[PDB]
Amino acid sequence: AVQKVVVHPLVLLSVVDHFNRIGKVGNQKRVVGVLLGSWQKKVLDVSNSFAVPFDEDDKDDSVWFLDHDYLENMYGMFKKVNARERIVGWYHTGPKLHKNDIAINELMKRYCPNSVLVIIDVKPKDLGLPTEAYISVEEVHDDGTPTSKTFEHVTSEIGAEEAEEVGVEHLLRDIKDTTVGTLSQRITNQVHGLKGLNSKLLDIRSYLEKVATGKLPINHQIIYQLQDVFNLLPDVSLQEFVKAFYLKTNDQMVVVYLASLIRSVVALHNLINNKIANRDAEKKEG
Amino acid sequence: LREELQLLQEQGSYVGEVVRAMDKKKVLVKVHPEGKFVVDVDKNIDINDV
Amino acid sequence: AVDTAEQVYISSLALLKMLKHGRAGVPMEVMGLMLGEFVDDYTVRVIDVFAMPQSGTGVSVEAVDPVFQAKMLDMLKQTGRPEMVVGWYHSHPGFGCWLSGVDINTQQSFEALSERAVAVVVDPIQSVKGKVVIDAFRLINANMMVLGHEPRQTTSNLGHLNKPSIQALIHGLNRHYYSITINYRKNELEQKMLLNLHKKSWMEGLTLQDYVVKEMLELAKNYNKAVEEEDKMTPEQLAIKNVGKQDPKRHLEEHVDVLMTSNIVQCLAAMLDTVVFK
Amino acid sequence: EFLHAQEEVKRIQSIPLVIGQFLEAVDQNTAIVGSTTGSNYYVRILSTIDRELLKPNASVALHKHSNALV
Amino acid sequence: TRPANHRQLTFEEIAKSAKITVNEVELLVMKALSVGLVKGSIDEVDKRVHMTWVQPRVLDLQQIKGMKDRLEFWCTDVKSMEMLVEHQAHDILT
Amino acid sequence: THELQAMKDKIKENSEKIKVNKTLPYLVSNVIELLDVDPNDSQRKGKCAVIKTSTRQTYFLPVIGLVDAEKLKP
Amino acid sequence: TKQYEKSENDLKALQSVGQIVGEVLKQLTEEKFIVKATNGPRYVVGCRRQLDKSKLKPGTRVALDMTTLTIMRYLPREVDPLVYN
Ligand SMILES: [Zn+2]
């Protein structure tokens, strides 16, 4: 089915500019629209879309209305300008979904065999790569529940396209690019420890929280099964590197040698050619 | 150079060949693959200088 | 009568549909329609841009369907903001995006339908990132030949718009037309996330996932050795001796700074061992 | 800001291009060059290396539009 | 159970809990290679079995307590020295 | 079952777009029989053919659309 | 009667413009492939992400795009007197 999806910044702003529509006029709920996808392969891609008037009552938390007259004719408007472009599902800005979303997806399954909902974020905050992707399947359950429809998380990645970077990448203008080789890798090292060890601390605190309350999730079993894959080496004090110690510096072997050897020749290029060219102009000027 | 490349960008700067000069202010210009075209002033190169 | 310098306020939502509908029609030229509101004489805003069907037989004035707009405007009523139509635009991917014979024919047709109907052109090929590209123009009345041809006031944006002068045929089309300046009203709410969403997904995909390595060092030490001896023969060519060869010649750059960054890469890449671990 | 401008000219002209045949160098920074069709055009050469890659006669890739020497 | 490694394991320790003869430790550890619970290659010179990967099973209340001891320890030891790398080296970033 | 007429209008308007495709070709082509299916790399299947021109160019377009490949030999 | 909607939607995919064909010559790098069109001009162009390693080939005909001149799909080359034979 659908493994991964690709969300462009263009369709994302089509959710954001509609937040300026219902934001100034109010009132409740959020931005909800129909998503126009493009399927050239198992990987899913999204280019454009169209926002539809949508409302969801609170009380009455399960009440939702799509507009099919706006869904029908405008599709033919977009089908005429773009033939390959078609609706792959719907979307919304969340941030957190509600149980009623089982009815929104099941109603539009007449248009598409599988509708993929995209939860986006209008204001970026935390903790990382934004928005979200969900796919609608039926896993039933191990406990004996009736057949259950639960949206499974789909990995989402942003992507670019030709001619769309004209105004987009121009308006920012404030970023330093890239710069690969100096600050690019070392900044992420401070981030991969930050973002890596905070979700670590966040999850281990939730694992302790599972003992107190919140059982189920049992999970099961993905919690500890994937944790033990991390446990191939812990690493614990100290590092158990007795076999990897003499190999450690052995990886630093070529790195230090190429450093000292080339820098000595780079110095021979820097020192010699400078003193030559400097002694030339200096003493011959006066 | 980027501004100079723009002047050479659109169709590219070609090399013409003048077979003869005319008294009508137009100068015959021949492209190697193509035929013999013609163009008028051209105020940089004078008519008698062609 | 009285004419003042006009300024185009564009929305980031309008700029996307410009190049995206333009990329869909590539290579061929499309015909669109501009959507927005007229605030006053000296400023004009385009708050939206919608897609229009491409013409495979060539652009014609009949490509714009009036009942297509009546249903589109009806869809804007149920939408949050139902703003009135303003003007038209067309992409020109195949060339330097100049107004063609069809572009002027739809001018007098649309300028009778709407007041301004500012002509907007765009091309993908001119640049990639750091150039606005696009285009803007407005038809000046040819019957004004009896009156003066030289408005407007506020020469600031007029002189900056006259430069670079964009080749020749564009200024050759300045007959019957005049350009118009384009500025960006602040999108910084979304423009802050536009830089954030782009760089967060462009840094190692999580910023984690990327941390070709030693195999590229064997390729690097080839560029740190084999490229060195060929570049260090030239200082021997600097000694003539002396002096029968044309001087000065500077062979220092750019490979010396490449070897600098090459060792900066491998040393900070070796730090990945001591960073991730302890 | 200058290194950012250096990254620009490094990309440009990138792709695509057209194959052509270099004829001769008339002066500095610009030379006449023929295309695959054998069209001799007046083209500004790329400003990085004007010497060892110019050659008396060589097959050079020219830009699709400008037919630029890079 | 153990944090190890302590990866390569001698035959006497396996022959203790499994109470198997030394001649049958061959079929013991090598059959699990076909089962898929461990891919470890055996070192037959000193007869010390070398484990690779691991097979997780179930969980226990003490396993969560053993996890929290050895999990956050990798978090707090790295984040400690991680700020040390950010301490001095940040001056060259700017 | 009354959606026919509204659906019959778009086939004539698309044929009206074929009627602007009727007027008018400056190009005449020669036909080449071809069968092409490319596995990726979910699956894209179909058939394509090769197209010549009177200007000596040779183009590439999927199998027509309208008249199918049942007729005829190139 | 939905076959009409199916037939017209297939004709909507026919709005996609046709490409041009050419013969591969050599390859300078991965981002530049020498290709000779049937007319005789030779271009070095990039490529898209839908192709595979079998697209390159030792001098076999390919289909160049009409914009960036990129290759879409490859087909076996024949001048086709033989079917007439
Ligand atoms: Zn046009």
Residue with tokens 């060589």: D58
Q: Residue C168 gets which letter from DSSP?
A: T
Per the CB < 8 A criterion, the answer to whether A204 and E75 are in contact is yes
Q: Residues with Cβ < 8 Å from D29, sequence gap 6 or more?
A: D44, D45, D47, D50
Q: Report the SS3 class of residue E65.
A: helix
Closest by Cα among A44, C10, B4 to D47: B4
Count residue pairs from C and E with Cβ separation < 8 A. 9
Half-sphere exposure of F66 (CA within 13 A, CB side): 7
Closest by Cα among C113, C60, C120 to C88: C120
G62 CB burial (10 A radius; 0-12, 13-18, 19+): buried
Rg, Å, chain C Cα set: 28
Give the span between the Cα atoms of C205 and D57, in whole angstroms.
Answer: 46
Residue D24 pairs in a beta bridge with D32
Give the span between the Cα atoms of C86 and C168, in whole angstroms.
Answer: 29
Per the CB < 8 A criterion, the answer to whether G78 and G70 are in contact is no
Give the span between the Cα atoms of A276 and A283, in whole angstroms.
Answer: 11
Give Cα separations from E85 to A180, A191, A236, A259, F46 (angstroms).
20, 12, 20, 21, 58
Give the span between the Cα atoms of D7 and C130, in whole angstroms.
Answer: 12
Contact across the interface for F61 and G20, Cβ inside 8 Å: no
Neighbours of B27 (CB within 10 A): 20
Closest by Cα among C95, F29, B33 to D66: C95
Contact across the interface for B2 and D67, Cβ inside 8 Å: no
Q: Which residues of G touch A111 (CB under 8 A)?
A: none
Nearest chain B residue to D31, by CA: B15
Give the span between the Cα atoms of C72 and A77, in whole angstroms.
Answer: 9
Nearest chain B residue to C170, by CA: B10
Q: Report the SS3 class of residue A6.
A: strand
Q: Report the SS3 class of residue A86.
A: strand
Tokens of C186: 């602040």
Does C92 show up as a binding residue in the annotation? yes
Give the span between the Cα atoms of A205 and C157, in whole angstroms.
Answer: 59
Tokens of A278: 């400097």
Q: Residues with Cβ < 8 Å from C15, sequence gap 6 or more?
A: A167, C49
Helices C255-276 and A245-285 sit at what angle, rounded to 10 degrees?
150
Strand G42-45 and strand G33-37: the pairing is antiparallel
Tokens of C144: 């004004």
Closest by Cα among C117, C115, C91 to C35: C117
Phi/psi at C242 (5° precision): -150, 145
Alpha carbon dihedral B16, B20, B23, B29, in 10-degree steps, equals: -20
Tokens of F47: 């058939």
Look at phi and psi of residue A40 and say left if phi exceeds 0, alpha if psi is from -120 to 50, else beta.
alpha
Give the span between the Cα atoms of F37 and C48, in whole angstroms.
Answer: 41
Q: Which residues of C touch D11 (CB under 8 A)?
A: 128
Q: Report the SS3 class of residue C68.
A: helix
Contact across the interface for C278 and E85, Cβ inside 8 Å: no
Give the span between the Cα atoms of C128 and F15, in whole angstroms.
Answer: 38
Alpha-helical segments (H) within A56-213: 68-81, 101-107, 165-172, 183-212
Neighbours of C203 (CB within 10 A): 19
HEC string of A148-187 equals CEEEEECCEEECCCCCCHHHHHHHHCCCCCCCCCCHHHHH
Tokens of E7: 């990866």
Opening angle at CA A131, ends A130 and A137, nearest 5: 135
Give the mutation candidate from G15, G16, G65, G70 for the A interface (greatest A CB count, under 10 A). G15
- Cα–chain center distance at A205: 24
Opening angle at CA B38, ends B35 and B44, nearest 5: 130
Residue A118 pairs in a beta bridge with A91
Looking at this protein, which amino acid is placed at residue B46? D
Give the span between the Cα atoms of A68 and C86, in whole angstroms.
Answer: 28
How many secondary structure helices (H) and strands (E) does chain G include?
1, 5
Edge-first strand order for the sheet with A118-119 is A118-119, A86-92, A32-38, A44-51, A5-7, A156-158
Per the CB < 8 A criterion, the answer to whether A208 and E72 are in contact is no
Tokens of D28: 């500095």
C202 CB burial (10 A radius; 0-12, 13-18, 19+): middle
Q: Report the SS3 class of residue C178.
A: strand
- Cα–chain center distance at C222: 40
Give the span between the Cα atoms of C206 and C188, in whole angstroms.
Answer: 24
Contact across the interface for A188 and C203, Cβ inside 8 Å: yes
Strand C177-178 and strand C138-139: the pairing is antiparallel
Tokens of A212: 């107190």
Give the span between the Cα atoms of A243 and C21, in whole angstroms.
Answer: 60
Look at phi and psi of residue E53 and say left if phi exceeds 0, alpha if psi is from -120 to 50, else beta.
left
Give the span between the Cα atoms of E80 and A193, in whole angstroms.
Answer: 10
Per the CB < 8 A criterion, the answer to whether C170 and B10 are in contact is no
Tokens of C81: 């903001």
- Cite the beta strand spans of chain C per DSSP E: 7-10, 32-37, 43-50, 85-91, 120-122, 138-139, 177-178, 181-184
Contact across the interface for C266 and A53, Cβ inside 8 Å: no
* C168-201 b/e (C-beta count within 10 Å ≥ 16 → b): eebeebeeebbbbebebeebeebbebbbebbebb
Per the CB < 8 A criterion, the answer to whether A52 and A68 are in contact is no
Per the CB < 8 A criterion, the answer to whether D22 and D57 are in contact is yes
Give the span between the Cα atoms of G74 and G56, in whole angstroms.
Answer: 9
Nearest chain C residue to B5, by CA: C167
Q: Report the SS3 class of residue C149.
A: coil
Q: Residues with Cβ < 8 Å from F8, sequence gap 6 or more?
A: G4
Opening angle at CA G31, ends F34 and G68, nearest 5: 55
Give the span between the Cα atoms of B38 and C105, in whole angstroms.
Answer: 30
Closest-CA distance, F70 to chain G, in angstroms, reads: 17
Give the span between the Cα atoms of G22 and G61, in whole angstroms.
Answer: 6
Give the span between the Cα atoms of A192 and A172, in whole angstroms.
Answer: 25
* Chains G and A contact (Cβ–Cβ under 8 Å for 3 or more pairs): yes
Give the span between the Cα atoms of A257 and C266, in whole angstroms.
Answer: 11
Q: Which residues of F touch G21 (CB under 8 A)?
A: 50, 58-60
Q: Residue C227 gets which letter from DSSP?
A: H
Q: Residues with Cβ < 8 Å from A34, sequence gap 6 or more?
A: A49, A50, A52, A66, A71, A87, A89, A90, A91, A108
Neighbours of C12 (CB within 10 A): 22
- Cα–chain center distance at A123: 15
Phi/psi at A201 (5° precision): -60, -35
Q: Which residues of B touch D38 (CB under 8 A)?
A: 32-33
Count residue pairs from C and G with Cβ separation < 8 A. 9
